[PDB]
Design an enzyme around this catalytic site. Structure first.
Site, PDB file in Angstrom:
ATOM      1  N   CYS A  99       0.867  -1.184   0.000  1.00 25.52           N
ATOM      2  CA  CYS A  99       0.000   0.000   0.000  1.00 25.52           C
ATOM      3  C   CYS A  99       0.893   1.220   0.000  1.00 25.52           C
ATOM      4  O   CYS A  99       1.467   1.561   1.012  1.00 25.52           O
ATOM      5  CB  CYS A  99      -0.966  -0.055   1.196  1.00 25.52           C
TER       6      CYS A  99
ATOM      7  N   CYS B 277       0.100   4.121   2.337  1.00 28.69           N
ATOM      8  CA  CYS B 277       0.425   3.741   3.713  1.00 28.69           C
ATOM      9  C   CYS B 277       1.867   4.106   4.057  1.00 28.69           C
ATOM     10  O   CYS B 277       2.159   4.615   5.151  1.00 28.69           O
ATOM     11  CB  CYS B 277       0.206   2.235   3.925  1.00 28.69           C
TER      12      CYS B 277
END
Length: 108
Positions: free
Chosen positions: A36, A39
């Site tokens: 991700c 993230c």
């Protein structure tokens, strides 16, 4: 020491163990994945927030703690969950540090 810091959990059961003995603190959980990109971007900003607010800041890799991810109904990453006094009180879905801070200010 203080429990108000950034911690990173290791296995299912860790979050429950934390909440069992810190029910009076705001707990802010960053459910993230290693796949991700956003993230990654938000991680340093989450650590900055953890330095300003007297809450427990928790990182959970959804692939390491798969049962915990399932239990909190996580899909998009990052998802930030606010937990206080025995229950989930709010969420922010997506990589929005400003909204995470608003949530902390709302529930701390």
């Amino acid at each position: 020491g203080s429990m108000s810091k950034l911690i990173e959990l290791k296995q299912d059961g860790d979050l429950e163990s934390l909440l069992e003995q810190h029910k009076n603190k705001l707990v802010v959980v960053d459910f993230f994945a290693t796949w991700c990109g956003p993230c990654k971007t938000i991680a340093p900003l989450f650590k900055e927030l953890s330095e300003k607010y007297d809450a427990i800041f928790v990182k959970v890799d959804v692939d390491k703690l798969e049962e915990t991810a399932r239990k909190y109904n996580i899909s998009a990453m990052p998802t930030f969950i606010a937990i206080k006094n025995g229950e989930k009180v709010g969420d922010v879905v997506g990589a929005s540090i400003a909204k995470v801070e608003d949530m902390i200010k709302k529930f701390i």
